[PDB]
Design a protein around this ligand. Structure first.
Ligand SMILES: CCCC[C@H](OP(=O)(O)O)C(=O)N[C@@H](CC(C)C)C(=O)Nc1ccc([N+](=O)[O-])cc1
Ligand SMILES: [Co+2]
Length: 166
């Protein structure tokens, strides 16, 4: 079932998510609810913190056909290198996009939907998405990489955008 995505400014988006102790039926229902919400909003990734669930869970689908589910429970970054960037957007910061510096390659370790560990070497868009989604778990948003002036602008814009759309 579709979940509600928080928008800035909401301090809840800055809470550091806790590690999942045991992947089970409940965790799995959350995983499914997250995919449903992500696909519904046409996003390519979604961190649990965005839907107000403070546990280290991320769902991703960077495919064109939109049928290639990637689940990262308790992700852990092992290596990262190179430099790249794209005009990132976020469901929590409606209508704003900004070029954010990211590592081009990134190797991680995580648990899948069944709680089994795997390691993944990613590059291109998938690498970027992972970095974006992982930042979400530690309360970091993509706007924090910009100059304070730009950050303030963004807050004013979303703040306004939301109030008018209510
Ligand atoms: C930035 C990595 C993805 C994270 C974001 O997902 P959530 O909001 O955390 C997202 O899905 N953002 C979308 C826009 C969103 C409002 C639906 C996004 O920025 N997609 C996107 C796709 C491809 C390219 N690209 O350059 O190929 C840029 C941006
Ligand atoms: Co985001």
């Amino acid at each position: 079932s579709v979940l509600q995505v928080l928008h800035i400014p909401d301090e809840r988006l800055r809470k550091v998510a806790k590690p999942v102790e045991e992947v089970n039926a409940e965790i799995q229902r959350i995983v499914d609810d997250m995919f449903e919400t992500m696909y519904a909003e046409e996003g390519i990734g979604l961190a649990a913190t965005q839907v107000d669930i403070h546990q280290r869970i991320i769902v991703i689908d960077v495919s064109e056909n939109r049928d290639e589910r990637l689940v990262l429970i308790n992700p852990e970054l092992l290596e990262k290198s190179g430099e790249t960037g794209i005009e990132e957007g976020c469901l929590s910061i409606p209508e704003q996009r900004a070029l954010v510096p990211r590592a081009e390659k990134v190797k991680i370790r995580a648990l899948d939907r069944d709680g089994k560990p795997f390691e993944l070497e990613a590059d291109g868009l998938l690498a970027i998405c992972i970095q974006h989604e992982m930042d979400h778990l530690v309360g970091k948003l993509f706007m924090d990489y910009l100059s304070p002036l730009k950050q303030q602008r963004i807050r004013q814009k979303v703040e306004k955008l939301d109030r008018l759309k209510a």
